[PDB]
Design a protein around this ligand. Structure first.
Ligand SMILES: *[C@@H]1O[C@H](CO)[C@@H](O)[C@H](O)[C@H]1NC(C)=O
Ligand SMILES: O=C1NCc2ccc(Cl)cc21
Ligand SMILES: [Zn+2]
Length: 220
């Protein structure tokens, strides 16, 4: 998260920290959010050979009692996710068991441009900076679709355009999969943006994927 503030520990109890394993490289990391006690929503590009989810984290380098480290049994990447257009960047993760509900861990129960939304994550705090030890959050402005025209594959139906180009505030690498909340309700999922982090950026529009989401939650 670029240009954000460190959150008060555990004030975002639905936040999930994902460690993703691949066969041919070291671990990678993403965000995500708990929407059922055994389901986490994240971005499809965060898929890998296997994933571990940590709930209840603030400083991800110091283990504490709030932590619940949970195995992911199955990954449900959206079947139409496209590695060229980046369309349908959404994935459900089924946890091996249901998480415990604590003060630090809970689910996130399932807008005109100009609205302020917020997004949290452990991602990099600058284009050349490492991932953040702690959960940061930033408030970002919802933009008209034309603000994102330079992303040639952007689609107003499938995606949100987020971030005032006049501010340096933005999500960045490692924040992928985290929810964008507008009015305390998840509206988007961090997906992609420019490599130099100049806003706006592109978020998955959750509402478009709701039937698919409900589908997976009923068949599993
Ligand atoms: C996070 O925890 C690590 C290990 O305890 C510590 O070195 C680091 O300074 C902490 N960062 C913050 C912002 O508290
Ligand atoms: O939101 C973003 N703006 C730039 C950017 C880069 C990478 C990722 Cl995962 C997200 C963003
Ligand atoms: Zn704590």
């Amino acid at each position: 998260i670029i240009g954000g503030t460190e959150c008060k520990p555990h004030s975002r109890p639905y936040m999930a920290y994902l460690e993703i394993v691949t066969s041919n490289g070291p671990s990678k990391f993403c965000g995500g959010f708990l929407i059922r006690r055994n389901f986490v929503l994240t971005a499809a590009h965060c898929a890998g050979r296997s994933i571990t989810v940590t709930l209840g984290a603030h400083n991800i380098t110091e283990e504490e009692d709030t932590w619940q480290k949970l195995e992911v049994i199955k990954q449900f990447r959206h079947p139409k996710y496209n590695t060229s257009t980046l369309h349908h960047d959404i994935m459900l993760l089924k946890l091996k068991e249901k998480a415990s509900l604590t003060l630090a861990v809970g689910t996130l129960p399932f807008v005109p441009p100009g609205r302020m939304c917020r997004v949290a994550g452990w991602g990099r705090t600058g284009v050349l900076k490492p991932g953040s030890d702690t959960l940061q959050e930033v408030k970002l402005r919802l933009m008209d679709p034309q603000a994102c025209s330079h992303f040639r594959d952007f689609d107003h139906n499938l995606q949100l355009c987020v971030g005032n180009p006049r501010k340096t505030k933005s999500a960045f690498k490692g924040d992928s999969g985290g929810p964008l909340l507008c009015a305390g309700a998840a509206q988007g999922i961090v997906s992609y943006g420019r490599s130099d982090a100049k806003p706006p950026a592109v978020f998955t529009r959750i509402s478009h994927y709701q039937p698919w989401i409900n589908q997976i939650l009923q068949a599993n």
